[PDB]
Amino acid sequence: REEAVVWDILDEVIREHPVLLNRAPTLHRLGIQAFEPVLIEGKAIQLHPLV
Amino acid sequence: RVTVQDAVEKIGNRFDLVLVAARRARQMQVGGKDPLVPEENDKTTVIALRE
Amino acid sequence: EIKELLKLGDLPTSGQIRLYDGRTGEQFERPVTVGYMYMLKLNHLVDDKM
Amino acid sequence: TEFLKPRLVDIEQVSSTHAKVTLEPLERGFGHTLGNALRRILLSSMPGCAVTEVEIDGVLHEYSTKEGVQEDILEILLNLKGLAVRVQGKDEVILTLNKSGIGPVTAADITHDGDVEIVKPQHVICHLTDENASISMRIKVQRGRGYVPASTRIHSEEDERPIGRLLVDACYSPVERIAYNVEAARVEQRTDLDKLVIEMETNGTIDPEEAIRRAATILAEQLEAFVDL
Amino acid sequence: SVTEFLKPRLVDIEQVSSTHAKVTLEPLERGFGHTLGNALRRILLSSMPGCAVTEVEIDGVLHEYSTKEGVQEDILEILLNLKGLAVRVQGKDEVILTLNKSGIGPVTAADITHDGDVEIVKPQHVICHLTDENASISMRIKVQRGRGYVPASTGRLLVDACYSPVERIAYNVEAARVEQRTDLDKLVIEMETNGTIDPEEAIRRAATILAEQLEAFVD
Amino acid sequence: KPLVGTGMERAVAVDSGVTAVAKRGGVVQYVDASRIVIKVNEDEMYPGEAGIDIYNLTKYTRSNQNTCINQMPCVSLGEPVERGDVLADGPSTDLGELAL
Amino acid sequence: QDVVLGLYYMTRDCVNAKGEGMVLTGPKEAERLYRSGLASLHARVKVRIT
Amino acid sequence: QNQRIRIRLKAFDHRLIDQATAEIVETAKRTGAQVRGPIPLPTRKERFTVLISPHVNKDARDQYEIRTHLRLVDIVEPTEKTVDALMRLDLAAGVDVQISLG
């Protein structure tokens, strides 16, 4: 039902759970990295510019 | 804090640092221990690191 | 001949215009290119992939 | 401490849609500071009035077509989205429309009221193209502010609308572009008094003599939190 | 809804120093974080009124070009260092103060002839260092009331005036959210100020300056 | 329409067969965004025929790639048309120029 | 690439500029000087530094 | 200068007659009329008393009422835009309108 509480719960679940992002192919160790997520309204994954 | 900066000095074996961080977090998660540091409603993994 | 057309319009023949930033109304330093490119939406739109 | 305060000395409704307004005098910088603040407020936050639903007699969904009319029903909705009207002391109203016989259909055909006023009678809804052809429809208008896409709106209504309504995306904000400009003017035999000019293009529902004060009001009350700290 | 836009509360004074603070507001409507953050910035950095050092007369000099001996740093630096002195003037347009000191060692603004009509709000501000057994210096420092920051464009030594007490102000806008949308703005204002006024109140002064413009339009 | 093109649009949009193209010259008899129907002139009619070319346009339909393809008229009632004029736009066209 | 473009532009010296050649007590009033539009960003200056 | 033209609004619920009143007076104001009203003309309260049982027991009876409220709204000043507007615009069905010309 996506009720109004669930986001305040989600923003507690995730509050510091690292998630692993990797492209493919992934030639070298730097090609999988972990980041702390922060929530977004859209549908794209917002990545950091330098990385 | 977001990373193990001082614990890297504590545990020069480096892998031992994951194994001790998980040991301490098992004291909290399964041994029922609670940490001393003054939280303000936050997820505890960054506290498990500190040992 | 592009310059000649831009002169027939009342437009600046440098093609560039000074712009301001709507976050402050400050001017940008040096003019910037402004004009009517043609842009295509491609069939790789995201909700079809998320 | 020597601050001259502004008054809104002059206005020029150059067209039924476009106008200029001027605020005079101002000190150092305040020509820019208000000049941009009011532009940014006028674009975001002027309330206005939009079509929001349309029910047409024999249609079922946006993608259909009506016999004897020049537009797909969809392009009728793309046309009505641009229609703009005043409403007098109401949060919403329903407009009926009827036409028959060949030729254009235009906003002048809406069943007029004292309490609704339309900015441009010639804005065109479709063509009729057959001798017996007709359309009748119930355009619903709502007040509001900003922009509200129908996809979120029906997700905000939470009852299930009937078959045979059409929904349109809401675009209330009545000002299409705003420009500001600053210059020195004759007051008190002195320099660096800015005549701010703000000049504006609109959908035609509002007059600057309201608009700039309403924008200044919004600013003045948002700013309360910073003096109430 | 139609005229009841969301209003912030201060989420914190977030204070890290008496000199600098990070006053943060939440929520603001989308885009207002600039419309107020920068508007108050442009007020704060350039149109706040206040009092500052404006001219100097050290004993017997025509131009800070002349590097008179007995002082460690030359007169170009004493001239800017005296711009560094924050001052409060009560009720007057321009006021001259006198300073002198003697003996080998530093000089400080505490050594000024403190009128009490004027407050030197940071006495411990070092002015220079003295460099001979006979070292002493005496000078007139003019302080003046004015507004903003005015450059050296306009025996006296002229100097830029720092009438606005804001040493720096900066602001950001950032994502904030409610139970059903995240397109709203947070606003962070950070500012640092010379000690004449505390920042959480300087901003209340500035918000007033801005409010006073609107007083002729607000209904 | 693209504002800057190459003048090849006037050919891709017609030859690709997706705009509906007037098979014979005449005058528009009726239009309604579903049908367009042309009173062909007797200089190009065949003698026993009624002399009337309908074009039932394809409306909203899936392309093989699921994009829609609704044809729309470009003509007006009573307007003259000549053999090979575009009567109805395709997808991605207007007035018979390609317009992606 | 854009970050380095910005830092290049910020740190050039242009031999003519607004506010060129004055002497400042620190970065903060350097910034006040820039932001108020009193000095151009690549203008030459002397500053006290630490 | 047509004489004063008056309208009778009759309704069962009073709120709907008041919405109709608001509509009419807003109309005649925006089209510039010397609006005079809305005179509240007396509620006709009709009563009925019917037996409840489908048989004997006369003493168990229900009594209902119907309240017909009137608003008399006068427009002394017609400027023919009022004429068009009034003759054009209708309302909901819980309100019935009747116009006296002069």
PDB file of C-alpha atoms in Angstrom, chain C residues 26 29-30, chain G residues 9 40 42:
ATOM      1  CA  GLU C  26      24.388  37.882 -11.804  1.00  0.00           C
ATOM      2  CA  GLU C  29      31.467  36.414 -17.639  1.00  0.00           C
ATOM      3  CA  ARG C  30      31.645  36.537 -21.441  1.00  0.00           C
TER       4      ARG C  30
ATOM      5  CA  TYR G   9      39.905  29.893 -14.995  1.00  0.00           C
ATOM      6  CA  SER G  40      37.734  40.467 -10.861  1.00  0.00           C
ATOM      7  CA  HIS G  42      41.864  36.767 -11.911  1.00  0.00           C
TER       8      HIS G  42
END
